[PDB]
Design an enzyme around this catalytic site. Structure first.
Site, short mmCIF file in Angstrom:
data_model
loop_
_atom_site.label_atom_id
_atom_site.label_comp_id
_atom_site.label_asym_id
_atom_site.label_seq_id
_atom_site.Cartn_x
_atom_site.Cartn_y
_atom_site.Cartn_z
N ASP A 181 -1.70 5.54 -5.40
CA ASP A 181 -2.00 4.63 -4.31
C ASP A 181 -2.34 3.21 -4.75
O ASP A 181 -3.42 2.96 -5.29
CB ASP A 181 -3.15 5.25 -3.51
CG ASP A 181 -3.62 4.39 -2.36
OD1 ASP A 181 -2.90 3.45 -1.97
OD2 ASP A 181 -4.71 4.68 -1.85
N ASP A 219 0.77 -1.24 0.00
CA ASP A 219 0.00 0.00 0.00
C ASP A 219 0.81 1.29 0.00
O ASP A 219 1.32 1.71 1.04
CB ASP A 219 -0.96 0.00 1.20
CG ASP A 219 -1.83 1.23 1.25
OD1 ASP A 219 -2.09 1.81 0.18
OD2 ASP A 219 -2.27 1.61 2.35
C1 LIG Z 1 -7.15 -3.48 -0.99
C2 LIG Z 1 -8.14 -3.02 -2.07
N1 LIG Z 1 -8.56 -1.66 -1.74
C3 LIG Z 1 -9.86 -1.32 -1.86
O1 LIG Z 1 -10.71 -2.19 -2.05
C4 LIG Z 1 -10.17 0.11 -1.73
C5 LIG Z 1 -9.37 1.00 -0.95
C6 LIG Z 1 -9.68 2.40 -0.82
O2 LIG Z 1 -9.01 3.32 -0.02
C7 LIG Z 1 -7.68 3.07 0.51
C8 LIG Z 1 -7.74 2.09 1.67
O3 LIG Z 1 -8.81 1.88 2.26
N2 LIG Z 1 -6.54 1.56 1.97
C9 LIG Z 1 -6.29 0.70 3.12
C10 LIG Z 1 -5.96 -0.73 2.71
C11 LIG Z 1 -7.16 -1.42 2.09
C12 LIG Z 1 -8.31 -1.57 3.08
C13 LIG Z 1 -9.51 -2.24 2.42
N3 LIG Z 1 -10.59 -2.35 3.41
C14 LIG Z 1 -10.83 2.91 -1.50
C15 LIG Z 1 -11.67 2.05 -2.28
O4 LIG Z 1 -12.82 2.61 -2.85
S1 LIG Z 1 -12.90 2.80 -4.43
O5 LIG Z 1 -13.07 4.20 -4.72
O6 LIG Z 1 -11.82 2.11 -5.03
C16 LIG Z 1 -14.44 2.00 -4.85
C17 LIG Z 1 -14.45 0.57 -4.39
C18 LIG Z 1 -15.05 0.26 -3.09
C19 LIG Z 1 -15.04 -1.12 -2.63
C20 LIG Z 1 -14.43 -2.13 -3.48
C21 LIG Z 1 -13.85 -1.84 -4.78
C22 LIG Z 1 -13.86 -0.46 -5.25
C23 LIG Z 1 -11.33 0.65 -2.40
C24 LIG Z 1 -7.55 -3.13 -3.43
C25 LIG Z 1 -8.29 -4.00 -4.32
C26 LIG Z 1 -7.80 -4.18 -5.65
C27 LIG Z 1 -6.57 -3.51 -6.00
F1 LIG Z 1 -6.11 -3.72 -7.22
C28 LIG Z 1 -5.81 -2.63 -5.14
C29 LIG Z 1 -6.32 -2.41 -3.82
#
Ligand SMILES: C[C@@H](NC(=O)c1cc(OCC(=O)NCCCCCN)cc(OS(=O)(=O)Cc2ccccc2)c1)c1ccc(F)cc1
Length: 371
Positions: free
Chosen positions: A219, A36
Protein backbone atom coordinates in the site's frame (compact mmCIF):
# COMPACT_ATOMS: atom_id res chain seq x y z
CA UNK A 1 13.72 4.85 -22.58
CA UNK A 2 10.43 4.97 -24.46
CA UNK A 3 8.64 5.84 -21.19
CA UNK A 4 10.92 8.82 -20.42
CA UNK A 5 8.12 11.37 -20.20
CA UNK A 6 6.62 9.52 -17.24
CA UNK A 7 9.89 9.50 -15.30
CA UNK A 8 9.95 11.80 -12.26
CA UNK A 9 6.21 12.47 -12.50
CA UNK A 10 5.65 12.11 -8.75
CA UNK A 11 6.18 14.55 -5.89
CA UNK A 12 6.15 14.17 -2.12
CA UNK A 13 9.74 12.96 -1.64
CA UNK A 14 10.21 14.23 1.90
CA UNK A 15 6.52 14.61 2.61
CA UNK A 16 3.15 13.21 3.52
CA UNK A 17 2.15 11.18 0.46
CA UNK A 18 3.31 10.77 -3.13
CA UNK A 19 1.12 12.42 -5.72
CA UNK A 20 0.77 12.78 -9.48
CA UNK A 21 -0.90 15.52 -11.50
CA UNK A 22 -4.25 14.63 -13.03
CA UNK A 23 -6.30 16.88 -15.30
CA UNK A 24 -10.07 16.57 -15.00
CA UNK A 25 -12.99 18.15 -16.80
CA UNK A 26 -13.26 20.67 -19.61
CA UNK A 27 -11.84 23.24 -19.70
CA UNK A 28 -8.85 21.61 -17.90
CA UNK A 29 -8.67 21.47 -14.09
CA UNK A 30 -5.39 19.95 -12.94
CA UNK A 31 -5.03 18.67 -9.37
CA UNK A 32 -2.39 16.91 -7.24
CA UNK A 33 -3.60 13.36 -6.57
CA UNK A 34 -2.32 10.92 -3.96
CA UNK A 35 -1.17 7.61 -5.47
CA UNK A 36 -2.87 4.96 -3.34
CA UNK A 37 -2.59 1.24 -4.05
CA UNK A 38 -4.50 0.61 -0.80
CA UNK A 39 -7.94 1.76 -2.00
CA UNK A 40 -10.00 1.78 -5.19
CA UNK A 41 -11.86 5.10 -5.41
CA UNK A 42 -10.80 8.12 -7.46
CA UNK A 43 -11.94 11.17 -5.47
CA UNK A 44 -11.06 14.85 -5.41
CA UNK A 45 -11.69 17.74 -3.08
CA UNK A 46 -14.61 19.64 -4.62
CA UNK A 47 -15.22 22.35 -2.01
CA UNK A 48 -12.88 24.75 -0.24
CA UNK A 49 -11.01 23.19 2.68
CA UNK A 50 -8.37 24.72 5.03
CA UNK A 51 -5.78 22.19 3.83
CA UNK A 52 -6.61 22.51 0.11
CA UNK A 53 -5.06 25.10 -2.22
CA UNK A 54 -7.33 24.12 -5.10
CA UNK A 55 -10.35 21.93 -5.73
CA UNK A 56 -12.60 20.51 -8.45
CA UNK A 57 -15.31 22.94 -9.60
CA UNK A 58 -17.93 20.81 -11.33
CA UNK A 59 -20.03 23.76 -12.50
CA UNK A 60 -17.07 24.91 -14.62
CA UNK A 61 -16.75 21.52 -16.35
CA UNK A 62 -19.02 21.19 -19.38
CA UNK A 63 -18.25 17.47 -19.58
CA UNK A 64 -19.20 16.65 -15.97
CA UNK A 65 -22.03 14.12 -15.63
CA UNK A 66 -23.86 13.74 -12.31
CA UNK A 67 -24.45 10.11 -11.29
CA UNK A 68 -26.95 11.21 -8.63
CA UNK A 69 -25.52 9.06 -5.85
CA UNK A 70 -23.67 9.74 -2.63
CA UNK A 71 -20.47 7.95 -1.67
CA UNK A 72 -18.65 7.60 1.65
CA UNK A 73 -15.19 6.10 2.08
CA UNK A 74 -13.51 5.40 5.44
CA UNK A 75 -9.76 4.68 5.58
CA UNK A 76 -7.28 3.82 8.34
CA UNK A 77 -6.70 7.57 8.67
CA UNK A 78 -9.87 9.59 8.25
CA UNK A 79 -12.83 9.47 5.90
CA UNK A 80 -14.73 11.59 3.40
CA UNK A 81 -18.28 11.97 2.07
CA UNK A 82 -19.00 12.99 -1.50
CA UNK A 83 -21.06 12.83 -4.66
CA UNK A 84 -20.47 10.56 -7.66
CA UNK A 85 -20.17 11.59 -11.29
CA UNK A 86 -18.04 11.04 -14.37
CA UNK A 87 -15.80 13.37 -16.32
CA UNK A 88 -12.86 13.36 -18.70
CA UNK A 89 -9.57 12.53 -17.01
CA UNK A 90 -6.02 12.61 -18.29
CA UNK A 91 -2.60 12.37 -16.67
CA UNK A 92 -0.26 14.97 -18.35
CA UNK A 93 2.91 13.11 -17.42
CA UNK A 94 1.31 9.70 -17.75
CA UNK A 95 -0.24 7.84 -20.73
CA UNK A 96 -1.17 9.82 -23.83
CA UNK A 97 -4.90 9.11 -23.54
CA UNK A 98 -8.07 10.60 -22.09
CA UNK A 99 -10.79 8.51 -20.47
CA UNK A 100 -14.19 9.17 -18.95
CA UNK A 101 -13.91 7.95 -15.37
CA UNK A 102 -15.97 7.76 -12.23
CA UNK A 103 -15.02 10.65 -9.98
CA UNK A 104 -16.09 11.20 -6.40
CA UNK A 105 -16.47 14.88 -5.58
CA UNK A 106 -15.42 15.21 -1.93
CA UNK A 107 -17.73 17.71 -0.25
CA UNK A 108 -17.04 16.99 3.43
CA UNK A 109 -14.25 15.11 5.20
CA UNK A 110 -12.78 14.19 8.58
CA UNK A 111 -9.02 13.99 9.07
CA UNK A 112 -8.52 12.85 5.47
CA UNK A 113 -6.58 15.69 3.87
CA UNK A 114 -3.17 16.40 5.38
CA UNK A 115 -2.06 19.96 6.11
CA UNK A 116 0.92 20.89 3.94
CA UNK A 117 0.86 17.64 1.94
CA UNK A 118 0.04 19.40 -1.34
CA UNK A 119 -2.34 16.71 -2.61
CA UNK A 120 -6.03 17.48 -3.10
CA UNK A 121 -7.47 14.10 -4.03
CA UNK A 122 -6.76 10.37 -4.15
CA UNK A 123 -6.27 7.77 -6.88
CA UNK A 124 -7.25 4.37 -5.54
CA UNK A 125 -5.38 1.88 -7.72
CA UNK A 126 -6.61 -1.33 -6.07
CA UNK A 127 -9.38 -3.55 -7.45
CA UNK A 128 -13.15 -3.17 -7.76
CA UNK A 129 -13.98 -5.56 -4.93
CA UNK A 130 -13.13 -2.93 -2.31
CA UNK A 131 -14.52 0.12 -4.14
CA UNK A 132 -17.40 2.05 -2.54
CA UNK A 133 -20.42 2.03 -2.69
CA UNK A 134 -19.73 -1.40 -4.20
CA UNK A 135 -17.75 -3.27 -6.86
CA UNK A 136 -19.99 -1.91 -9.63
CA UNK A 137 -18.22 1.46 -9.40
CA UNK A 138 -15.37 0.83 -11.83
CA UNK A 139 -11.99 2.05 -10.55
CA UNK A 140 -9.86 4.43 -12.62
CA UNK A 141 -7.25 1.94 -13.81
CA UNK A 142 -9.97 -0.50 -14.88
CA UNK A 143 -11.48 2.29 -17.01
CA UNK A 144 -8.08 3.18 -18.43
CA UNK A 145 -7.41 -0.39 -19.59
CA UNK A 146 -10.91 -1.00 -20.96
CA UNK A 147 -11.23 2.30 -22.81
CA UNK A 148 -7.69 2.39 -24.20
CA UNK A 149 -4.73 0.36 -25.48
CA UNK A 150 -2.75 0.96 -22.26
CA UNK A 151 -1.35 -2.37 -20.98
CA UNK A 152 -2.82 -3.59 -17.68
CA UNK A 153 0.28 -2.75 -15.65
CA UNK A 154 1.82 0.14 -13.77
CA UNK A 155 5.00 0.51 -11.73
CA UNK A 156 5.98 2.75 -8.82
CA UNK A 157 9.35 4.15 -7.79
CA UNK A 158 8.80 6.11 -4.58
CA UNK A 159 11.89 8.13 -3.70
CA UNK A 160 12.07 9.07 -0.04
CA UNK A 161 14.40 11.34 1.90
CA UNK A 162 9.38 12.35 -5.49
CA UNK A 163 9.48 9.41 -7.86
CA UNK A 164 8.02 7.82 -10.96
CA UNK A 165 4.74 6.13 -11.79
CA UNK A 166 5.16 4.35 -15.12
CA UNK A 167 1.74 3.55 -16.59
CA UNK A 168 1.48 0.76 -19.14
CA UNK A 169 5.01 -0.48 -18.66
CA UNK A 170 8.41 -0.45 -17.01
CA UNK A 171 11.41 1.88 -17.29
CA UNK A 172 14.74 0.10 -16.72
CA UNK A 173 16.55 3.21 -15.45
CA UNK A 174 14.48 3.13 -12.25
CA UNK A 175 16.07 -0.04 -10.84
CA UNK A 176 19.24 -2.09 -10.65
CA UNK A 177 19.64 -5.86 -10.57
CA UNK A 178 16.81 -8.26 -11.33
CA UNK A 179 13.07 -7.99 -10.86
CA UNK A 180 11.62 -10.71 -8.63
CA UNK A 181 7.90 -11.45 -8.64
CA UNK A 182 5.44 -12.56 -6.00
CA UNK A 183 1.88 -13.65 -6.84
CA UNK A 184 -1.07 -11.37 -6.20
CA UNK A 185 -2.97 -13.81 -3.99
CA UNK A 186 -6.38 -12.28 -4.58
CA UNK A 187 -7.58 -9.23 -6.49
CA UNK A 188 -9.08 -6.80 -3.95
CA UNK A 189 -6.18 -5.09 -2.16
CA UNK A 190 -2.81 -5.95 -3.69
CA UNK A 191 -2.52 -8.98 -1.42
CA UNK A 192 0.71 -10.95 -1.12
CA UNK A 193 2.08 -13.70 1.11
CA UNK A 194 5.09 -13.22 3.40
CA UNK A 195 6.79 -16.50 4.27
CA UNK A 196 9.73 -15.54 6.49
CA UNK A 197 11.12 -12.50 8.29
CA UNK A 198 14.72 -11.83 9.33
CA UNK A 199 16.39 -9.07 11.33
CA UNK A 200 20.06 -8.77 10.33
CA UNK A 201 19.86 -12.28 8.87
CA UNK A 202 18.31 -13.75 12.02
CA UNK A 203 15.00 -15.58 11.52
CA UNK A 204 12.19 -14.13 13.65
CA UNK A 205 11.05 -17.76 13.86
CA UNK A 206 7.30 -17.25 13.81
CA UNK A 207 4.73 -19.40 12.07
CA UNK A 208 4.32 -17.74 8.66
CA UNK A 209 0.56 -17.71 9.21
CA UNK A 210 1.21 -14.93 11.76
CA UNK A 211 2.92 -12.72 9.15
CA UNK A 212 -0.24 -12.73 7.03
CA UNK A 213 -2.81 -13.08 9.81
CA UNK A 214 -5.88 -11.64 8.18
CA UNK A 215 -3.87 -10.38 5.17
CA UNK A 216 -0.67 -8.77 3.85
CA UNK A 217 -0.91 -5.94 1.31
CA UNK A 218 1.28 -3.50 -0.61
CA UNK A 219 0.00 0.00 0.00
CA UNK A 220 1.56 3.22 -1.28
CA UNK A 221 -1.00 5.19 0.73
CA UNK A 222 0.32 3.94 4.09
CA UNK A 223 3.47 5.47 5.57
CA UNK A 224 4.72 2.62 7.76
CA UNK A 225 5.54 -1.04 7.60
CA UNK A 226 2.67 -2.22 9.76
CA UNK A 227 2.76 -5.66 11.34
CA UNK A 228 0.24 -7.86 13.17
CA UNK A 229 0.55 -7.34 16.95
CA UNK A 230 2.41 -10.63 17.63
CA UNK A 231 4.86 -10.06 14.77
CA UNK A 232 5.37 -6.44 15.75
CA UNK A 233 6.24 -7.44 19.32
CA UNK A 234 8.76 -10.09 18.24
CA UNK A 235 10.20 -7.76 15.59
CA UNK A 236 10.78 -4.89 18.02
CA UNK A 237 12.45 -7.23 20.51
CA UNK A 238 14.83 -8.51 17.83
CA UNK A 239 15.56 -5.02 16.46
CA UNK A 240 16.34 -3.77 19.97
CA UNK A 241 18.66 -6.73 20.56
CA UNK A 242 20.51 -6.08 17.28
CA UNK A 243 20.95 -2.37 18.08
CA UNK A 244 21.85 -2.89 21.76
CA UNK A 245 25.03 -0.80 21.44
CA UNK A 246 22.63 2.10 21.99
CA UNK A 247 19.51 2.37 24.13
CA UNK A 248 16.30 4.22 23.27
CA UNK A 249 13.09 4.79 25.27
CA UNK A 250 10.13 2.43 24.87
CA UNK A 251 8.15 5.27 23.33
CA UNK A 252 10.60 5.50 20.44
CA UNK A 253 9.78 1.91 19.47
CA UNK A 254 6.06 2.74 19.67
CA UNK A 255 6.44 5.76 17.37
CA UNK A 256 5.43 8.09 20.21
CA UNK A 257 8.87 9.59 20.84
CA UNK A 258 11.34 11.02 18.34
CA UNK A 259 15.12 10.82 18.66
CA UNK A 260 17.31 13.45 17.03
CA UNK A 261 20.99 13.48 16.07
CA UNK A 262 23.31 16.36 15.19
CA UNK A 263 22.97 17.04 11.45
CA UNK A 264 24.57 14.22 9.47
CA UNK A 265 25.59 12.05 12.42
CA UNK A 266 22.81 9.43 12.55
CA UNK A 267 24.54 6.10 13.38
CA UNK A 268 22.77 4.09 10.69
CA UNK A 269 25.28 1.29 11.35
CA UNK A 270 23.91 0.47 14.81
CA UNK A 271 20.47 -0.42 13.39
CA UNK A 272 19.79 -3.79 11.67
CA UNK A 273 18.54 -4.49 8.17
CA UNK A 274 15.12 -6.12 7.81
CA UNK A 275 14.20 -8.85 5.33
CA UNK A 276 10.79 -10.04 4.19
CA UNK A 277 10.71 -13.25 2.15
CA UNK A 278 7.84 -13.35 -0.32
CA UNK A 279 6.29 -16.34 -2.07
CA UNK A 280 7.76 -16.71 -5.54
CA UNK A 281 6.39 -17.70 -8.93
CA UNK A 282 7.65 -21.30 -8.74
CA UNK A 283 6.55 -23.97 -6.24
CA UNK A 284 8.58 -23.94 -2.99
CA UNK A 285 10.59 -20.96 -4.25
CA UNK A 286 10.78 -17.58 -2.53
CA UNK A 287 12.92 -14.45 -2.67
CA UNK A 288 13.64 -11.71 -0.15
CA UNK A 289 13.54 -7.94 -0.04
CA UNK A 290 15.75 -6.18 2.49
CA UNK A 291 15.46 -2.64 3.76
CA UNK A 292 17.86 -0.46 5.72
CA UNK A 293 17.30 1.84 8.70
CA UNK A 294 17.23 4.66 6.14
CA UNK A 295 13.84 3.23 5.12
CA UNK A 296 12.26 2.41 8.49
CA UNK A 297 13.61 5.48 10.35
CA UNK A 298 11.71 8.42 8.85
CA UNK A 299 12.89 12.07 9.01
CA UNK A 300 10.64 14.65 10.67
CA UNK A 301 10.43 18.08 8.99
CA UNK A 302 21.28 21.34 12.86
CA UNK A 303 19.10 18.50 14.13
CA UNK A 304 17.96 15.40 12.26
CA UNK A 305 14.92 14.00 14.06
CA UNK A 306 13.59 10.54 13.25
CA UNK A 307 10.54 8.43 14.01
CA UNK A 308 10.61 4.63 14.13
CA UNK A 309 8.22 3.78 11.29
CA UNK A 310 7.37 0.13 11.97
CA UNK A 311 4.10 -0.10 13.89
CA UNK A 312 1.37 -2.53 14.87
CA UNK A 313 -1.85 -3.33 13.06
CA UNK A 314 -5.00 -5.33 13.81
CA UNK A 315 -5.83 -5.69 10.09
CA UNK A 316 -2.75 -7.55 8.86
CA UNK A 317 0.65 -6.59 7.47
CA UNK A 318 0.82 -3.38 5.46
CA UNK A 319 3.89 -2.95 3.27
CA UNK A 320 3.74 0.82 3.02
CA UNK A 321 6.21 3.55 2.01
CA UNK A 322 8.81 2.19 4.44
CA UNK A 323 9.00 -0.88 2.20
CA UNK A 324 8.25 0.71 -1.18
CA UNK A 325 10.86 3.47 -0.84
CA UNK A 326 13.62 0.88 -1.11
CA UNK A 327 12.34 -0.67 -4.33
CA UNK A 328 10.92 -0.23 -7.79
CA UNK A 329 7.58 -2.02 -7.56
CA UNK A 330 5.86 -3.44 -10.64
CA UNK A 331 2.10 -3.95 -10.28
CA UNK A 332 1.75 -6.46 -13.11
CA UNK A 333 -2.04 -6.81 -13.03
CA UNK A 334 -2.07 -8.60 -16.40
CA UNK A 335 0.01 -11.45 -14.98
CA UNK A 336 -1.42 -11.22 -11.43
CA UNK A 337 1.99 -10.58 -9.88
CA UNK A 338 3.95 -7.84 -8.11
CA UNK A 339 7.61 -7.33 -8.96
CA UNK A 340 10.36 -5.96 -6.73
CA UNK A 341 13.78 -4.62 -7.67
CA UNK A 342 16.35 -2.47 -5.86
CA UNK A 343 15.39 1.15 -6.51
CA UNK A 344 17.88 3.43 -8.25
CA UNK A 345 16.77 6.22 -5.88
CA UNK A 346 16.61 4.39 -2.55
CA UNK A 347 18.53 6.02 0.29
CA UNK A 348 21.58 4.15 1.54
CA UNK A 349 25.20 4.62 2.59
CA UNK A 350 28.64 3.40 1.51
CA UNK A 351 28.34 0.24 3.63
CA UNK A 352 24.87 -1.17 3.00
CA UNK A 353 22.22 -1.12 0.30
CA UNK A 354 18.64 -2.33 0.07
CA UNK A 355 18.44 -5.64 -1.77
CA UNK A 356 16.23 -8.13 -3.58
CA UNK A 357 17.73 -11.60 -3.62
CA UNK A 358 16.78 -15.14 -4.48
CA UNK A 359 15.88 -17.76 -4.98
CA UNK A 360 15.39 -19.51 -1.65
CA UNK A 361 13.71 -22.76 -0.71
CA UNK A 362 10.61 -22.41 1.44
CA UNK A 363 8.10 -25.24 1.85
CA UNK A 364 4.37 -25.14 2.65
CA UNK A 365 4.06 -21.49 1.60
CA UNK A 366 0.44 -22.10 0.59
CA UNK A 367 -0.46 -22.63 4.26
CA UNK A 368 0.77 -19.15 5.24
CA UNK A 369 -2.32 -17.46 3.85
CA UNK A 370 -5.34 -16.64 6.02
CA UNK A 371 -8.68 -18.13 4.98
C1 LIG B 1 -0.83 9.74 2.76
C2 LIG B 1 0.09 9.28 3.89
N1 LIG B 1 -0.60 8.22 4.62
C3 LIG B 1 -0.56 8.20 5.96
O1 LIG B 1 -0.12 9.17 6.58
C4 LIG B 1 -1.08 6.98 6.62
C5 LIG B 1 -2.10 6.17 6.02
C6 LIG B 1 -2.61 4.99 6.67
O2 LIG B 1 -3.64 4.18 6.20
C7 LIG B 1 -4.10 4.22 4.83
C8 LIG B 1 -4.94 5.46 4.57
O3 LIG B 1 -5.42 6.10 5.51
N2 LIG B 1 -5.09 5.73 3.26
C9 LIG B 1 -5.96 6.78 2.74
C10 LIG B 1 -5.18 7.91 2.08
C11 LIG B 1 -4.36 8.69 3.10
C12 LIG B 1 -5.25 9.39 4.12
C13 LIG B 1 -4.41 10.13 5.16
N3 LIG B 1 -5.32 10.79 6.12
C14 LIG B 1 -2.07 4.62 7.95
C15 LIG B 1 -1.07 5.42 8.58
O4 LIG B 1 -0.67 5.04 9.86
S1 LIG B 1 0.80 4.45 10.08
O5 LIG B 1 0.69 3.12 10.61
O6 LIG B 1 1.55 4.65 8.90
C16 LIG B 1 1.46 5.47 11.39
C17 LIG B 1 1.41 6.93 11.02
C18 LIG B 1 0.26 7.73 11.45
C19 LIG B 1 0.20 9.13 11.07
C20 LIG B 1 1.29 9.68 10.27
C21 LIG B 1 2.46 8.90 9.86
C22 LIG B 1 2.52 7.50 10.24
C23 LIG B 1 -0.57 6.60 7.91
C24 LIG B 1 1.41 8.85 3.37
C25 LIG B 1 2.53 9.60 3.92
C26 LIG B 1 3.85 9.28 3.47
C27 LIG B 1 3.97 8.24 2.47
F1 LIG B 1 5.20 7.99 2.04
C28 LIG B 1 2.89 7.47 1.91
C29 LIG B 1 1.57 7.76 2.39
Amino acid sequence: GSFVEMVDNLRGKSGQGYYVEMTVGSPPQTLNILVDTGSSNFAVGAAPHPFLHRYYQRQLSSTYRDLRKGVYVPYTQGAWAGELGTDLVSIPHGPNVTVRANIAAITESDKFFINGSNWEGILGLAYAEIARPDDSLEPFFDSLVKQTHVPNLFSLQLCGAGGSMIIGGIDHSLYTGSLWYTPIRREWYYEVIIVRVEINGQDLKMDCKEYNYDKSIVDSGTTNLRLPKKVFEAAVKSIKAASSTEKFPDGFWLGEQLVCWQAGTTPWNIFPVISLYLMGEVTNQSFRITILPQQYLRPVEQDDCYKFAISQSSTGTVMGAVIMEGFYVVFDRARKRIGFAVSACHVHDEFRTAAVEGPFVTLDMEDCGYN
